[PDB]
Amino acid sequence: SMSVKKPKRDDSKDLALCSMILTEMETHEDAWPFLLPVNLKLVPGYKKVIKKPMDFSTIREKLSSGQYPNLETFALDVRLVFDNCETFNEDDSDIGRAGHNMRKYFEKKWTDTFK
C-alpha cells in the first residue's frame, strides 16, 4: 500500500533474459508455424476466428522497441501464440503437435530462468 512495499526483486536483467528465451524459441526446429504472422489473405477463417494474432517475429519487434512493460506481459504474448494455435489446429496435426511441443519448451525455460 502507500509507503508499504515488498522488497525490490531485481528486474534489471529481465529484458536480456526474455530476449534469450525468445532466441531459443526462434531456433527450435518446431518453431516454423510461429516465426511469422499467419497470412490473413491466404488462410481462410483466421482473421475472423483469431481475435488477437501473435507470432515470434511480432514479439521480437515488441521486445526490441520497449513495448513490454514487464516480464509478465511478454509471457502473455508467448502463451497467446500457443493458445491461438490450439484454437485453429487439430491436436493430431503437425502444427497442433508443434504448438504443444513449443509451449512445453517455453514453460520450462520460463520456470528455470525466473522461478
C-alpha 99/C-alpha 89 separation (Å) is 9
Q: How many residues would you count in the chain?
A: 115
Q: Name 37's Cβ contacts closer than 8 Å, sequence gap at least 6.
A: 53, 55, 57, 58
Question: Is residue 75 a contact partner of residue 110, using CB atoms and an 8 Å limit?
Answer: yes
Which residue is associated with the grid cell 508499504?
4
18 burial level (CB within 10 Å; 0-12, 13-18, 19+): buried
CA atoms within 13 A on the CB side of 49: 13
Please give the domain boundaries of the chain with CATH numbers for all domains. 1-115 (1.20.920.10)
Which residue is associated with the grid cell 503437425?
94
> CA-based diameter of the chain, in Å?
54
The structure's method of determination equals X-ray
Question: Is residue 18 a contact partner of residue 63, using CB atoms and an 8 Å limit?
Answer: yes
